[PDB]
Structure 1
Amino acid sequence: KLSEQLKHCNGILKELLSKKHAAYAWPFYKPVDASALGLHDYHDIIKHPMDLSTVKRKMENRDYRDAQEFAADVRLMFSNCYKYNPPDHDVVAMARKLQDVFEFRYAKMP
């Protein structure tokens, strides 16, 4: 019923992680390494971080009831990025490109 939804959501997640979109997806593969980047205020501004490895773990853990919940985390990931950064920063451009793939594939599911 909605296990078919989550099966399609799993397919989206594979696409998002795939090599073809890697030039814009790579900054969302792992949690932002605030420490390495020298960002003292990242966890002050982003209360609930999110990234695709996390989304994958929750997928495998069956933590998502339905596709809305999947989509809420994926959008959280992008919004965090837009929230933290100025609009001229390369990571924002990249988030936009990857959200295009996501919004498209998520619109086409049953």
Structure 2
Amino acid sequence: KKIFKPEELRQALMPTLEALYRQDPESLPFRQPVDPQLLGIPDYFDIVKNPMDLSTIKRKLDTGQYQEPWQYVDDVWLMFNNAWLYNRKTSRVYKFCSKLAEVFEQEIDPVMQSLG
């Protein structure tokens, strides 16, 4: 149990999010919210109940809307789980998601220990 300052969470967690942005082109389909009408995928919101993307996570850090570090981690995992759920395992976006998940898994473990 701990009260976290939003600036403390930003300085600690934003580097792990930037490590995902730096993956090019793997991060490109994750940088903005999925737009099913534009992309022609009307079943997306049938499958994905709670969408999440990098720009939404970044804004929540910038505005202090995470109270605790595990809320940030849950949003990153939600973004990954949505992409693995909707896209087929042979697809470009599914393989992109696995690469981003590999990067995040290596970045987030010591950061979470330092925060407590």
3-state DSSP class of the match of 2:17? helix
3-state DSSP class of the match of 1:24? coil
How many residues get paired? 108
| Residue 8 of structure 1 pairs with residue 12 of structure 2 | yes
Which segment drifts farther, 5-14 or 85-94? 5-14
1:1-110 superposed matches below 5 A:
2-3=4-5, 4-18=8-22, 21-109=23-111, 110=114
- In structure 1, what is the Cα distance between the partners aligned to 2:71 and 2:10? 10
- In structure 1, what is the Cα distance between the partners aligned to 2:10 and 2:30? 21
Does the 8 Å CA contact 2:52/2:78 hold for their aligned counterparts? yes
- In structure 2, what is the Cα distance between the partners aligned to 1:16 and 1:29? 9
Over residues 51-84 of structure 1, what are the superposed CA-to-partner deviations in whole Å (9 max), with x where a residue is unaligned? 0000011111101012111000000000001111
CA RMSD of the aligned region, Å?
A: 1.5
In structure 1, the gaps of 5 or more residues are none
3-state DSSP class of the match of 1:32? coil
1:2 Cα deviation after fit: 4.0
Does the 8 Å CA contact 1:6/1:66 hold for their aligned counterparts? no
Runs of 4+ in structure 1 deviating by more than 3 angstroms, as ranges, are 1-6
- In structure 2, what is the Cα distance between the partners aligned to 1:67 and 1:27? 25
TM-score computed with the length of structure 1 as normaliser: 0.89
Q: Which amino acid aligns with 1:30?
A: Q
1:108 Cα deviation after fit: 2.2
TM-score computed with the length of structure 2 as normaliser: 0.85
Over residues 6-45 of structure 1, what are the superposed CA-to-partner deviations in whole Å (9 max), with x where a residue is unaligned? 4211111122223xx1221111000112112211111111
3-state DSSP class of the match of 2:42? coil
- In structure 2, what is the Cα distance between the partners aligned to 1:38 and 1:85? 14
